[PDB]
Nucleic acid binder design. Structure first.
Lengths: 81, 32, 52, 738
RNA sequence: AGACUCUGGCAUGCUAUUCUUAGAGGGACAAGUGGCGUUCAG
């Protein structure tokens, strides 16, 4: 099966704003999807959680400096607010 | 600076480098 | 008994398997089904779904 | 043409090359330049074929001219130069590095030529190109792959320059430079690479923006021929320091830096699958990682799968030698209780652990496999075990089944045999998986058990067929496969008793069981092909087994049509065209039915029969089958529209359109003309790169800070080849996605 | 050769409930593994 564009956009914005709170496997990512989005559709929730898990698995194999500066910017935005 | 200006700058710098690195008949005979 | 096997139960699947095994056993041993098999199959299907 | 010595000599070729150096038309005429360096490339290839050291000695001037024409703005000259230098490196440089050997800074012979041409490509890595940097990076990559093991002491400065190039604020050649550094790490070896460019993540760092953090992904993705001893002597204490600092800042309240260090430590044991690819000292350096792997697999779950993957990587390509396999086996005797406690623990990544356990038990000694089989058997027979624990020990029995001898396999079969009649679906499924696993091996103790207990297995499988659960059908048919590929001729009654199970499994709930049933139908056909002298009569005797399934139950009718569809797709030309025609008449009679499954399988069989037999035999029966198609129904035509559409498309393509128009009514006339119209219509790893919303190359960008010096070796960091630079929120703050 | 909508296989979980019921909640998301791969889509 293919991934819907709105699933891609939701996964992008979720992994962009809340990368710190997401975990490794599917269950804790689904939990973060539960208390970060109300997400009335179950299949959309499952596809979003699976694609966010795949996205963070792809990201965690990359360089560390981008993750570090992203966490620094997220901490700065959280402290400013 | 900009694309065209930097292109002209690098071309002139390469020209000056070649000119400062600089300071017959074609060998038609294979064997002497 | 639904036509699709994905809805029916496993005990019914085993009973149907026993029925089809037995049916293969008598109809493989019938003497008329030894010389012209496809002719017999065609005639049997022809009567069965001209009944339909 | 590569002439011989009688036509062209080495000295004559060298004289021709040195005389042909003196033209260089202007700089960028682009009509004779490509063929110009092409003919020096061919002449250098011929010179290396005739006298390789003379060709290597003549190479550096040609490489300097290649750099000079790579400075040309025309990209065609760039592509031609890149292809020529890559061909020279692959054909004239790579096979001759074994004879030359290592190169030092004071080389004399052809090693000095290699050093000079590397100085030429280092000068080609300078700032003056600004548009050929991808080509120079590819040339550096193929040079690294060619001569990493033989040009080791000299290319540290090039690695430092590459790190400086990747330290640019805007680098469009990041992927190419990553590939080049990966090839350098692969062939050079990351040990002396890290000696050249050091990792600045050693323990405590005052900053968080690591300027060499891509080295760990590069080493992870591009290590295949590095010794494990360097990994043990370098990455073991640094791991402990980084992890200890990670907990120290975790309980200090600073979660961002703790998560950064957690990312660092979780990424730096991903180097272990790379280091276990082909280690040159795994016979001696694997002792120092046994307890480390045990502690990382016992109380460190976050690495476990990767560690298991690392182990799996070794089992892929680290057991070539016999001493290596002996050390792996002895440490398997060390590890197996730990792995069995890890898999058997309650909850867990059981799939990867089970795959690693199977792949790791296929390469160990037989006797402790037998001992663990005894332990698992007494664990299964113990009534004080839970259902999940029983399933885990049954999975361990499945893993240990093909690795045991004939006696252990026989006693395991004797233990499993009363369990086939159990009412639990999981127990019977594991029992059938055990029966499939003990018969899966075509040679060894499993085959000996197969021929030793063939009649007992046949009687047991015939007795347990009545009480088989639906998932248990999926492995069991494969087990039947494992008892048919080496079956004797006097077993026709067992096979024809198995046929209804296969036909009913062709429409089983699981699609894996359906594929297994189709493969089993193929295996019955192949087995009957070996049981008779006449293959067509044997195929007919196979066919008379499954034809009476067209008579009885509706789901049996659909199963038999699908079985005949797979048989016709697998036994196309060997069963008879007239049989295909009469089966086509029969399946059109079944097309005239009411049940949608039967008519759907009939449409599939009609499509397959159209595909299989020739148009000459088809033309005799076009009218009958297409009349059966035409007067079908109103709702049945509407539901499966695409199958009739594809059938009409095939009939139009394989025949004349006029007869096809004539043999259908007006609604089908409109369908046919629409189908005719349709036929007429036919005639990289960074965060921001992944999260993307998904002449010209000669532009340059200066940056103006410190004043710019063109002769500064680090000015290439200041030049850029590219341009610099929706949901709703609820009351709780949670987004709404729809 | 439907990248349309919906849904089913197992529930010894909840409700008047392990065997018959009928509402809701879990469970499947290609999830994982090895290869072919532009080293990412498939």
């Amino acid at each position: 099966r293919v991934r819907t564009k709105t699933v891609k956009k939701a996964a992008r914005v979720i992994i962009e704003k809340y990368y710190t709170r997401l975990g490794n496997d599917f269950h804790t990512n689904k939990r973060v999807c539960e208390e970060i989005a109300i997400i009335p559709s179950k299949k959309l929730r499952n596809k979003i959680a699976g694609y966010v898990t795949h996205l963070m698995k792809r990201i965690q194999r990359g360089p560390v400096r981008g993750i570090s500066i992203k966490l620094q910017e997220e901490e700065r935005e959280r402290r400013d607010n | 600076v900009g694309p065209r200006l930097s292109r002209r700058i690098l071309q002139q710098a390469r020209q000056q480098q070649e000119e400062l690195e600089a300071e017959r008949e074609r060998t038609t005979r294979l064997g002497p | 008994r639904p036509s699709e096997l994905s809805r029916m139960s496993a005990a019914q699947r085993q009973q149907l398997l026993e029925e089809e095994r037995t049916r293969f056993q008598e109809l493989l041993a019938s003497p008329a089904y030894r010389a012209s098999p496809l002719v017999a199959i065609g005639q049997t299907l022809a009567r069965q779904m001209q009944l339909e | 043409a590569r002439p011989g010595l009688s036509t062209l000599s080495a000295e004559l070729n060298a004289q021709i090359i040195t005389a042909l150096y003196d033209y260089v038309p202007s700089e960028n005429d682009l009509q004779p330049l490509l063929a110009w360096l092409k003919v020096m490339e061919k002449a250098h290839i011929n010179l290396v074929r005739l006298q390789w050291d003379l060709g290597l000695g003549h190479l550096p001037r040609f490489f300097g001219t290649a750099v000079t024409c790579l400075l040309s703005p025309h990209s065609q000259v760039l592509t031609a130069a890149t292809q020529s230098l890559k061909e020279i490196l692959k054909e004239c440089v790579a096979p001759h590095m074994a004879d030359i050997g290592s190169v030092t800074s004071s080389a004399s012979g052809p090693a000095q030529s290699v050093a000079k041409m590397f100085r030429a490509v280092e000068e080609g890595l300078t700032y003056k190109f600004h548009a050929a940097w991808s080509s120079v990076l590819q040339l550096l990559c193929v040079f690294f792959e060619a001569c990493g093991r033989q040009a080791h002491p000299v290319m540290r400065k090039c690695l430092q320059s590459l790190c400086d190039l990747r330290l640019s604020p805007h680098f469009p050649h990041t992927a190419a430079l990553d590939q080049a550094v990966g090839a350098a790490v692969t062939s050079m070896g990351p040990e002396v690479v890290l000696q050249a460019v050091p990792l600045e993540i050693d323990g405590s760092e005052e900053t968080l923006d690591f300027p060499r953090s891509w080295l760990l992904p590069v080493i992870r993705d591009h290590v295949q021929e590095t010794r494990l001893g360097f990994f043990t002597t370098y990455f073991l204490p640094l791991a402990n320091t980084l992890k200890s600092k990670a907990m120290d800042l975790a309980q200090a309240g600073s979660t961002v830096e703790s998560k950064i260090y957690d990312t660092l430590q979780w990424q730096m044991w991903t180097l272990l699958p790379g280091f276990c690819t082909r280690p040159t000292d795994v016979a001696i350096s694997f002792k120092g990682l046994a307890r480390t792997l045990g502690m990382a697999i016992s109380e460190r779950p976050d690495l476990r799968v990767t560690v298991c993957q690392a182990l799996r990587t070794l089992i892929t390509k680290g057991c070539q030698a016999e001493a290596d396999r002996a050390e792996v086996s002895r440490f398997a005797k060390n590890f197996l209780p730990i792995l069995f406690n890890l898999y058997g623990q309650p909850v867990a990544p059981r799939r990867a652990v089970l795959e690693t356990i199977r792949t790791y038990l296929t390469i160990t000694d037989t006797q402790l496999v037998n001992s663990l089989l005894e332990k698992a058997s007494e664990k299964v027979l113990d009534p004080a075990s839970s259902d999940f624990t029983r399933l885990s020990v049954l999975d361990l029995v499945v893993a240990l089944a093909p690795c045991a001898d004939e006696a252990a396999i026989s006693k395991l079969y004797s233990t499993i045999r009363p369990y086939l009649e159990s009412k639990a679906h999981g127990v019977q499924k594991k029992a059938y998986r055990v029966l499939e696993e003990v018969c899966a091996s075509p040679q060894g103790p499993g085959a000996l058990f197969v021929q030793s207990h063939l009649e007992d297995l046949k009687k047991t499988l015939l007795d347990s067929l009545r009480s088989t659960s639906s998932p248990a059908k999926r492995p069991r048919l494969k087990c039947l496969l494992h008892i048919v590929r080496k079956l004797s001729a006097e077993h026709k009654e067992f096979i024809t008793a198995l046929i209804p199970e296969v036909i009913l499994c062709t429409k089983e709930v699981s699609v894996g069981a359906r594929k297994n049933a189709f493969a089993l139908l193929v295996e019955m056909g192949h087995a009957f092909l070996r049981f008779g002298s006449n293959q067509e009569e044997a195929l007919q005797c196979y066919l008379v087994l499954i034809y009476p399934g067209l008579v009885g139950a509706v789901t049996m009718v659909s199963c038999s049509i699908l079985a005949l569809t797979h048989l016709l797709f697998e036994f196309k030309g060997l069963m008879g065209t007239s049989t295909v025609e009469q089966l086509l008449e029969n399946v059109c009679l079944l097309l005239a039915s009411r049940t949608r499954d039967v008519v759907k399988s009939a449409l599939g069989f009609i499509k397959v029969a159209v595909t299989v037999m020739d148009v000459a035999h088809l033309a005799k029966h076009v009218q009958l089958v297409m009349e059966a198609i035409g007067k079908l129904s109103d709702d049945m035509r509407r539901h499966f529209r695409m199958k009739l559409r594809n059938l009409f498309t095939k009939f139009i393509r394989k025949f004349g359109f006029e007869l096809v128009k004539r043999l259908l009514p007006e609604e089908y006339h409109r369908v046919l003309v629409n189908i005719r119209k349709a036929e007429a219509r036919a005639k990289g790893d960074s965060i921001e790169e992944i999260l993307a919303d998904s002449r010209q190359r000669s532009r340059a960008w200066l940056k103006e800070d410190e004043p710019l010096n063109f002769l500064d070796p680090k000015v290439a960091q200041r030049v850029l080849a590219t341009q610099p630079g929706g949901f709703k929120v609820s009351a709780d703050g949670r987004l709404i996605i729809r």
